[PDB]
Amino acid sequence: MDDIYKAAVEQLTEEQKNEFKAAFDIFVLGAEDGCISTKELGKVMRMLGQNPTPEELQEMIDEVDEDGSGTVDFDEFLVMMVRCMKDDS
């Protein structure tokens, strides 16, 4: 259950959260609503030198998005950040 994330997030230090929170604000550099969509991710990938298809971006979000809403919020972003880091424990 998402309980694992709760404990992982709760354990996280205030400084660690602030660092990720700062990135979140930057990520929405392309969103006025403060939400992260394919457009925001598309810009990030573009800088990295990657320019795939929009269909792939949508599918990627679905993989991380449990609701499949196609959008990523702060809560989802935080979970994704921790999940990605844990992936390599």
């Binding site: 660092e19 990720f20 990135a23 990520f27 990295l48 990657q50 990605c84 880091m85 992936d87 390599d88």
Partner: peptide, 27 residues
């Protein structure tokens, strides 16, 4: 297979953690 941006590239893209030149990967 042939995954992209495992996490190192992303960390460099933004502030996050320097993690030096690697985390727990040999060379």
């Amino acid at each position: 297979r042939r995954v992209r941006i495992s996490a190192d590239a992303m960390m460099q893209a933004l502030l996050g953690a320097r993690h030096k030149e690697s985390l727990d990967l040999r060379a």
